CSV table of C-alpha atoms and ligand atoms in Angstrom, one decimal:
chain,number,residue,atom,x,y,z
A,1,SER,CA,4.8,4.5,-31.5
A,2,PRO,CA,6.0,2.9,-28.2
A,3,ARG,CA,3.9,3.0,-25.5
A,4,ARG,CA,5.2,5.6,-22.8
A,5,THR,CA,4.9,5.9,-19.0
A,6,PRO,CA,3.1,9.5,-17.8
A,7,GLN,CA,6.7,11.0,-17.7
A,8,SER,CA,7.4,9.9,-21.3
A,9,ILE,CA,9.6,7.0,-21.3
A,10,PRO,CA,8.9,3.8,-23.2
A,11,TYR,CA,7.5,0.7,-21.3
A,12,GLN,CA,10.2,-1.1,-23.4
A,13,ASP,CA,13.1,0.1,-21.5
A,14,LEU,CA,11.0,-1.0,-18.0
A,15,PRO,CA,10.2,-3.8,-16.2
A,16,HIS,CA,6.4,-3.7,-16.6
A,17,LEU,CA,2.8,-5.9,-17.1
A,18,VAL,CA,-0.2,-5.1,-19.0
A,19,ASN,CA,-2.9,-5.4,-16.7
A,20,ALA,CA,-6.7,-6.9,-17.4
A,21,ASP,CA,-7.9,-4.1,-18.8
A,22,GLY,CA,-4.9,-3.2,-21.0
A,23,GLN,CA,-3.1,-0.6,-19.0
A,24,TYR,CA,0.5,-0.8,-18.5
A,25,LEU,CA,1.9,-1.2,-14.6
A,26,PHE,CA,5.6,0.0,-14.3
A,27,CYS,CA,7.2,-2.8,-12.0
A,28,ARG,CA,10.0,-3.1,-9.5
A,29,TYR,CA,11.9,-6.4,-8.6
A,30,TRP,CA,14.9,-6.8,-6.1
A,31,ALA,CA,16.5,-10.2,-5.8
A,32,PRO,CA,19.0,-11.5,-3.8
A,33,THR,CA,22.0,-13.2,-5.3
A,34,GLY,CA,20.9,-16.9,-4.1
A,35,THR,CA,17.8,-19.2,-4.1
A,36,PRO,CA,15.3,-17.1,-2.2
A,37,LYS,CA,13.6,-18.4,0.8
A,38,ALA,CA,10.3,-16.4,-0.1
A,39,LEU,CA,9.1,-14.1,-2.2
A,40,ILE,CA,7.1,-10.6,-1.1
A,41,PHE,CA,5.0,-8.5,-2.6
A,42,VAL,CA,5.5,-4.5,-1.8
A,43,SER,CA,1.8,-2.5,-1.8
A,44,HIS,CA,2.2,1.1,-1.7
A,45,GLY,CA,-0.5,3.7,-0.9
A,46,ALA,CA,-2.5,6.7,-2.3
A,47,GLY,CA,-0.4,9.2,-4.1
A,48,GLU,CA,2.7,7.8,-4.3
A,49,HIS,CA,4.5,5.2,-5.8
A,50,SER,CA,6.9,1.9,-5.3
A,51,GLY,CA,10.4,3.8,-5.1
A,52,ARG,CA,9.0,5.1,-2.1
A,53,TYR,CA,9.8,1.4,-0.9
A,54,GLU,CA,13.6,1.3,-1.8
A,55,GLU,CA,14.8,0.9,1.5
A,56,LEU,CA,12.6,-1.4,3.4
A,57,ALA,CA,13.1,-3.7,-0.2
A,58,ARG,CA,16.5,-3.5,0.0
A,59,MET,CA,16.6,-5.0,3.7
A,60,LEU,CA,13.6,-7.6,2.8
A,61,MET,CA,15.9,-8.7,0.0
A,62,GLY,CA,19.1,-9.1,2.8
A,63,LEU,CA,17.3,-11.8,4.2
A,64,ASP,CA,17.1,-13.6,1.1
A,65,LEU,CA,13.6,-12.5,-0.4
A,66,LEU,CA,12.3,-12.0,-3.5
A,67,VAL,CA,10.9,-8.5,-3.7
A,68,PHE,CA,8.4,-7.1,-6.2
A,69,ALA,CA,5.7,-4.3,-6.8
A,70,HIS,CA,4.5,-2.5,-9.4
A,71,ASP,CA,2.6,1.1,-9.4
A,72,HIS,CA,-0.6,1.0,-9.0
A,73,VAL,CA,-3.0,2.3,-11.8
A,74,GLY,CA,-3.2,6.2,-11.9
A,75,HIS,CA,0.3,6.1,-9.7
A,76,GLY,CA,4.0,6.4,-10.6
A,77,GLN,CA,5.3,5.4,-13.5
A,78,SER,CA,1.9,2.8,-13.9
A,79,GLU,CA,-0.5,4.5,-17.0
A,80,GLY,CA,-4.0,5.9,-16.0
A,81,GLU,CA,-5.7,8.8,-15.5
A,82,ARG,CA,-4.1,10.3,-11.7
A,83,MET,CA,-5.3,9.1,-9.2
A,84,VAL,CA,-8.4,7.8,-10.4
A,85,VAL,CA,-10.0,4.1,-10.4
A,86,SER,CA,-13.1,2.4,-12.0
A,87,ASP,CA,-13.5,0.2,-9.1
A,88,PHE,CA,-11.1,-0.5,-6.0
A,89,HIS,CA,-11.0,-4.1,-6.9
A,90,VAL,CA,-8.6,-3.3,-9.8
A,91,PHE,CA,-5.8,-2.5,-7.4
A,92,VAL,CA,-6.7,-6.2,-6.0
A,93,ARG,CA,-6.7,-7.5,-9.4
A,94,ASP,CA,-3.4,-6.5,-10.7
A,95,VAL,CA,-1.7,-7.2,-7.4
A,96,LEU,CA,-2.9,-10.8,-7.9
A,97,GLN,CA,-2.1,-10.8,-11.4
A,98,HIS,CA,1.5,-9.9,-10.5
A,99,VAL,CA,1.7,-12.4,-7.7
A,100,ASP,CA,0.5,-14.9,-10.4
A,101,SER,CA,2.9,-14.4,-12.7
A,102,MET,CA,5.9,-14.1,-10.1
A,103,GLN,CA,4.9,-17.7,-8.8
A,104,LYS,CA,4.9,-19.3,-12.0
A,105,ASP,CA,8.6,-17.9,-12.6
A,106,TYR,CA,9.4,-19.3,-8.6
A,107,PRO,CA,7.5,-22.2,-7.8
A,108,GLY,CA,7.0,-23.9,-4.5
A,109,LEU,CA,7.8,-20.6,-2.7
A,110,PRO,CA,5.8,-18.9,0.2
A,111,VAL,CA,4.2,-15.4,-0.7
A,112,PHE,CA,4.4,-12.7,1.6
A,113,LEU,CA,2.3,-9.1,1.1
A,114,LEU,CA,3.6,-6.1,2.7
A,115,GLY,CA,0.9,-2.8,2.5
A,116,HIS,CA,1.1,1.0,4.0
A,117,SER,CA,-1.9,2.8,4.4
A,118,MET,CA,-4.6,2.3,1.0
A,119,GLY,CA,-1.8,-0.1,0.2
A,120,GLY,CA,-2.9,-2.4,3.4
A,121,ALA,CA,-6.3,-2.2,2.3
A,122,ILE,CA,-5.4,-3.8,-0.7
A,123,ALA,CA,-2.9,-6.2,0.9
A,124,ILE,CA,-6.2,-7.3,3.6
A,125,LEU,CA,-8.6,-7.6,0.5
A,126,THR,CA,-5.6,-9.3,-1.6
A,127,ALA,CA,-5.1,-12.1,1.4
A,128,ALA,CA,-9.0,-12.1,2.0
A,129,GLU,CA,-9.6,-13.6,-1.6
A,130,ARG,CA,-7.4,-16.1,-1.4
A,131,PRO,CA,-7.5,-17.8,1.9
A,132,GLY,CA,-4.8,-19.8,2.9
A,133,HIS,CA,-2.3,-18.4,0.1
A,134,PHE,CA,-0.6,-16.4,1.5
A,135,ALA,CA,2.3,-17.0,4.2
A,136,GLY,CA,2.0,-13.8,6.0
A,137,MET,CA,1.1,-9.8,5.7
A,138,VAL,CA,2.8,-7.1,7.1
A,139,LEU,CA,0.5,-3.6,7.6
A,140,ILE,CA,2.2,-0.4,8.6
A,141,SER,CA,-0.8,1.9,9.4
A,142,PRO,CA,-3.6,0.4,6.9
A,143,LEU,CA,-6.8,2.1,5.8
A,144,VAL,CA,-8.9,0.1,7.8
A,145,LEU,CA,-11.1,3.4,9.5
A,146,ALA,CA,-10.7,6.7,8.3
A,147,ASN,CA,-10.0,9.7,10.6
A,148,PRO,CA,-13.4,10.2,12.2
A,149,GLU,CA,-13.6,14.1,11.6
A,150,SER,CA,-12.1,13.8,8.3
A,151,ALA,CA,-15.0,10.8,7.3
A,152,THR,CA,-18.0,12.6,8.2
A,153,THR,CA,-16.7,15.9,5.8
A,154,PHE,CA,-16.1,13.3,3.1
A,155,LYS,CA,-19.4,11.6,3.2
A,156,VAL,CA,-21.2,14.9,2.9
A,157,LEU,CA,-19.4,15.7,-0.3
A,158,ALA,CA,-19.8,12.2,-1.6
A,159,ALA,CA,-23.5,12.6,-1.3
A,160,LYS,CA,-23.1,15.5,-3.6
A,161,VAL,CA,-21.4,13.5,-6.2
A,162,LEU,CA,-23.8,10.4,-5.7
A,163,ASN,CA,-26.9,12.1,-6.3
A,164,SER,CA,-25.7,15.2,-9.0
A,165,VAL,CA,-23.2,15.1,-12.3
A,166,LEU,CA,-20.3,16.7,-10.9
A,167,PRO,CA,-17.2,14.9,-12.5
A,168,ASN,CA,-14.4,17.2,-11.6
A,169,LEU,CA,-15.2,17.5,-7.9
A,170,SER,CA,-12.5,17.3,-5.7
A,171,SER,CA,-11.3,17.7,-1.8
A,172,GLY,CA,-8.4,19.2,-0.5
A,173,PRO,CA,-4.7,17.6,-0.7
A,174,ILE,CA,-3.4,15.0,2.1
A,175,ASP,CA,-2.0,17.6,4.8
A,176,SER,CA,1.8,16.7,4.5
A,177,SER,CA,2.9,18.0,8.2
A,178,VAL,CA,0.3,14.8,9.6
A,179,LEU,CA,2.3,12.4,7.7
A,180,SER,CA,5.6,11.9,9.5
A,181,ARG,CA,7.1,14.3,12.6
A,182,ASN,CA,10.3,13.8,10.8
A,183,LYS,CA,10.6,17.2,8.9
A,184,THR,CA,13.1,15.9,6.0
A,185,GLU,CA,10.7,13.1,5.4
A,186,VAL,CA,8.1,15.5,4.3
A,187,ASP,CA,10.6,17.8,2.9
A,188,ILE,CA,11.2,14.8,0.4
A,189,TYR,CA,7.9,13.8,0.0
A,190,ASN,CA,7.3,17.3,-1.3
A,191,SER,CA,10.0,16.9,-3.5
A,192,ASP,CA,9.4,13.9,-5.5
A,193,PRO,CA,7.7,14.4,-9.2
A,194,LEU,CA,6.1,11.1,-8.9
A,195,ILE,CA,4.2,11.8,-5.9
A,196,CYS,CA,0.8,13.2,-6.7
A,197,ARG,CA,-0.1,15.6,-4.0
A,198,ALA,CA,-3.2,17.0,-5.6
A,199,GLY,CA,-6.5,17.3,-3.6
A,200,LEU,CA,-8.4,13.8,-3.5
A,201,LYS,CA,-10.7,13.7,-6.1
A,202,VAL,CA,-14.3,12.8,-5.0
A,203,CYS,CA,-14.7,9.9,-7.4
A,204,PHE,CA,-11.2,8.6,-5.6
A,205,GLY,CA,-12.4,9.6,-2.2
A,206,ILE,CA,-15.5,7.3,-3.1
A,207,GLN,CA,-13.1,4.2,-3.8
A,208,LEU,CA,-11.3,4.6,-0.6
A,209,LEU,CA,-15.0,4.4,1.2
A,210,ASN,CA,-15.4,1.1,-0.6
A,211,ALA,CA,-12.3,-0.1,0.6
A,212,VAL,CA,-13.2,0.6,4.2
A,213,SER,CA,-16.7,-1.4,3.5
A,214,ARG,CA,-14.9,-4.3,2.1
A,215,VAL,CA,-12.5,-4.3,4.3
A,216,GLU,CA,-14.8,-4.5,7.5
A,217,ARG,CA,-16.8,-7.6,5.6
A,218,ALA,CA,-13.4,-9.2,5.1
A,219,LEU,CA,-12.0,-9.7,8.7
A,220,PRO,CA,-14.3,-12.3,9.7
A,221,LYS,CA,-13.0,-14.3,7.2
A,222,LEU,CA,-9.1,-13.1,7.2
A,223,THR,CA,-7.0,-15.9,8.5
A,224,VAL,CA,-3.5,-14.9,7.2
A,225,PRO,CA,-0.6,-14.4,9.9
A,226,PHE,CA,0.1,-10.4,9.9
A,227,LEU,CA,2.2,-7.7,11.9
A,228,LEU,CA,0.4,-4.6,12.3
A,229,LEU,CA,2.4,-1.8,12.9
A,230,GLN,CA,0.6,1.5,14.1
A,231,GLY,CA,1.2,5.1,15.2
A,232,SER,CA,-1.3,6.7,18.0
A,233,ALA,CA,-0.7,10.0,16.6
A,234,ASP,CA,-1.9,8.8,13.3
A,235,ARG,CA,-4.4,11.6,11.9
A,236,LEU,CA,-5.1,9.8,8.5
A,237,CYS,CA,-5.9,6.1,9.5
A,238,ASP,CA,-7.4,6.1,13.1
A,239,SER,CA,-5.7,4.1,15.5
A,240,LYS,CA,-9.0,2.6,16.5
A,241,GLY,CA,-8.9,0.4,13.4
A,242,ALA,CA,-5.9,-1.8,13.8
A,243,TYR,CA,-7.1,-2.3,17.2
A,244,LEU,CA,-10.5,-3.6,15.2
A,245,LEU,CA,-8.3,-5.3,13.1
A,246,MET,CA,-6.6,-7.2,16.0
A,247,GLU,CA,-10.0,-7.7,17.4
A,248,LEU,CA,-12.0,-8.7,14.3
A,249,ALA,CA,-9.5,-10.9,12.3
A,250,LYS,CA,-10.0,-14.8,12.8
A,251,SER,CA,-6.0,-15.4,12.4
A,252,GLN,CA,-4.2,-17.4,14.6
A,253,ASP,CA,-1.1,-15.3,14.5
A,254,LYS,CA,-1.8,-12.1,14.8
A,255,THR,CA,0.6,-9.5,16.3
A,256,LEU,CA,0.3,-5.3,17.3
A,257,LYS,CA,2.9,-2.6,17.8
A,258,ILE,CA,1.7,0.6,18.5
A,259,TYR,CA,4.2,3.6,18.2
A,260,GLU,CA,3.0,6.2,20.6
A,261,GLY,CA,3.2,9.8,19.7
A,262,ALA,CA,3.9,8.7,15.6
A,263,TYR,CA,2.1,9.9,12.9
A,264,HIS,CA,1.1,8.0,9.9
A,265,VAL,CA,4.1,6.8,7.6
A,266,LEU,CA,5.9,4.6,10.4
A,267,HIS,CA,8.8,3.7,7.8
A,268,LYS,CA,9.5,7.7,7.4
A,269,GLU,CA,8.8,8.7,10.8
A,270,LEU,CA,11.8,9.7,13.5
A,271,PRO,CA,14.6,7.6,13.3
A,272,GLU,CA,14.1,5.6,16.3
A,273,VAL,CA,10.6,4.7,15.1
A,274,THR,CA,11.6,3.9,11.8
A,275,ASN,CA,14.6,1.8,13.1
A,276,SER,CA,11.9,-0.2,15.3
A,277,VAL,CA,9.7,-0.8,12.4
A,278,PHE,CA,12.6,-2.1,9.8
A,279,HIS,CA,13.7,-4.3,12.9
A,280,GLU,CA,10.6,-5.8,13.8
A,281,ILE,CA,9.3,-6.4,10.2
A,282,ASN,CA,13.2,-8.2,9.8
A,283,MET,CA,12.3,-10.3,12.8
A,284,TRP,CA,8.9,-11.4,12.0
A,285,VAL,CA,9.7,-12.1,8.4
A,286,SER,CA,12.6,-14.3,9.6
A,287,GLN,CA,10.9,-15.9,11.8
A,288,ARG,CA,8.2,-17.2,9.6
A,289,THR,CA,10.7,-17.9,6.2
A,290,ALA,CA,13.7,-20.6,6.1
B,1,LIG,O1,-2.5,5.5,1.3
B,1,LIG,C1,-1.9,6.6,1.8
B,1,LIG,N1,-3.3,7.4,2.0
B,1,LIG,C2,-4.7,7.0,1.8
B,1,LIG,C3,-5.2,7.8,3.0
B,1,LIG,C4,-5.9,7.6,4.4
B,1,LIG,C5,-7.4,8.0,3.8
B,1,LIG,C6,-8.3,8.5,4.9
B,1,LIG,C7,-8.9,9.5,4.0
B,1,LIG,C8,-10.4,8.6,3.5
B,1,LIG,C9,-10.7,7.3,4.1
B,1,LIG,C10,-11.5,7.3,3.1
B,1,LIG,C11,-11.9,8.4,2.3
B,1,LIG,N2,-11.0,9.1,2.6
B,1,LIG,B1,-11.4,11.0,2.2
B,1,LIG,F1,-10.9,10.9,0.8
B,1,LIG,F2,-11.9,11.9,2.5
B,1,LIG,N3,-10.2,11.3,2.6
B,1,LIG,C12,-9.6,12.8,2.3
B,1,LIG,C13,-8.2,13.0,3.3
B,1,LIG,C14,-8.1,11.7,4.3
B,1,LIG,C15,-9.1,10.9,3.5
B,1,LIG,C16,-6.6,8.6,2.8
B,1,LIG,C17,-3.7,8.1,3.4
B,1,LIG,N4,-1.1,7.2,1.8
B,1,LIG,C18,-0.4,8.6,1.7
B,1,LIG,C19,0.5,8.1,1.6
B,1,LIG,C20,1.5,8.0,3.0
B,1,LIG,C21,2.2,9.2,2.0
B,1,LIG,N5,3.9,9.2,2.2
B,1,LIG,C22,4.8,8.5,1.6
B,1,LIG,N6,5.8,9.0,1.8
B,1,LIG,C23,5.6,10.2,3.0
B,1,LIG,C24,6.9,10.6,4.0
B,1,LIG,C25,6.3,12.1,4.2
B,1,LIG,C26,6.3,10.8,5.2
B,1,LIG,N7,4.5,9.9,3.1
B,1,LIG,C27,1.9,8.6,1.0
B,1,LIG,C28,-0.4,6.8,1.7
């Protein structure tokens, strides 16, 4: 019987890739009508999926880039227990497999990464694993340092799971009101059935703590060009992390844009913020492609 997504659609009817663990990942592609100037992989964050990047991907495709993405394991239309990962490196390995596959089909093209939140931590670790390979990285509120109050609370709960056998332990869900000041976007997020809005399992939170530790060790090795966009009122990824990334990365081409008063999800924020985010990404990638 055909292998199906967690929503029961056969993978033979969808673009897909099988990872090193034999798990099917659902894929998306947005290719221009002509010869692409560059490739760009979009890395989504925790709980969400690649379908949330439709508008950004169509803008990037309008710049003649071939945009590609997949749903990370345990997310969206990919296989895996929801919001579970054996080790955070699985996400990085799977991005690298997909980038390597695309570079075979489109050789000689520059490749960029774009990531938001947990997806931004994945993009940083992917670029750190392959120094000099990526042309540039666009980071939207990347997970570099978690909110101090939330991290201390979770680190206590993590000690309970690390010292004892407690497989079902979960913390509370990611509060939707702190995601964006745009209420319509929050309402849409709360209505998408492919988004997992359940409480974070302690085993998954432990992997996000591993991502933060690994990002910290990767910064003095990071040399890829990057554009970093961060809101000053982010309650999920503390803005101190964006300043730390600007300070500690060795990249010769690094830029930070702060959005005063904005919340976490800058590409789904108030129209003035979202319009600026799209324009800034468009300028930055346009200047670095030809
Ligand atoms: O990747 C992330 N996640 C990673 C994230 C930061 C983490 C902080 C944290 C940590 C860190 C270590 C350990 N922890 B933890 F587990 F203790 N923890 C608990 C709560 C936060 C937190 C949790 C947020 N997101 C959330 C989204 C944005 C959402 N969206 C998509 N469309 C929209 C529209 C409405 C605007 N919103 C999906 C991508």
